[PDB]
Nucleic acid binder design. Structure first.
Ligand SMILES: [Mg+2]
Ligand SMILES: [Mg+2]
Ligand SMILES: [Mg+2]
Ligand SMILES: [Mg+2]
Ligand SMILES: [Mg+2]
Length: 87
RNA sequence: GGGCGUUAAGUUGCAGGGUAUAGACCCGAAACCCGGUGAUCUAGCCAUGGGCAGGUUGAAGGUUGGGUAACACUAACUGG
């Protein structure tokens, strides 16, 4: 992912624009990467070697979302509403 | 010597018997060729119009909500 894009996401989701390790920041980065690779996997359908990384990112995002939902539901709902997710 | 002849009158008309060529005592074919008439029936094609009551199952597809990182998949409705 682009360094400028990562910096923009960190500034948008974090507090001091330097934590860059919060659950919301990680989920946003994973979602952005998945959405960017959506167009890559819509053409190269025989790229399972890179699709495994996408699946790993999906699993990591799901685990982070479950942890956020278990810890603070208020932040989880706001994050999913902002990112357009459904669960 | 042997074969063919010599030694011995035919021809022209009429009538008739017979033969040949023509259809040839008479009727009767399936069939061949040439020139014409027929697609108002029927076979096909083209152009232009008309007709198929009523009652049935419910395909592709299209929204809705979930189900996927999303395509798939799947529930109802609609669709005809
Ligand atoms: Mg002599
Ligand atoms: Mg005489
Ligand atoms: Mg005579
Ligand atoms: Mg005619
Ligand atoms: Mg009818």
């Amino acid at each position: 992912l682009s360094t400028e894009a990562t910096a923009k996401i960190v500034s948008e989701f974090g507090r001091d624009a330097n934590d860059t390790g919060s659950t919301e920041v990680q989920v946003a980065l994973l979602t952005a990467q998945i959405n960017h690779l959506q167009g890559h996997f819509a053409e190269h359908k025989k790229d399972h070697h890179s699709r495994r990384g996408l699946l790993r990112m999906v699993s990591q995002r799901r685990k982070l979302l479950d942890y956020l939902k278990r810890k603070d539901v208020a932040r989880y709902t706001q994050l999913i509403e902002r990112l357009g997710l459904r669960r």
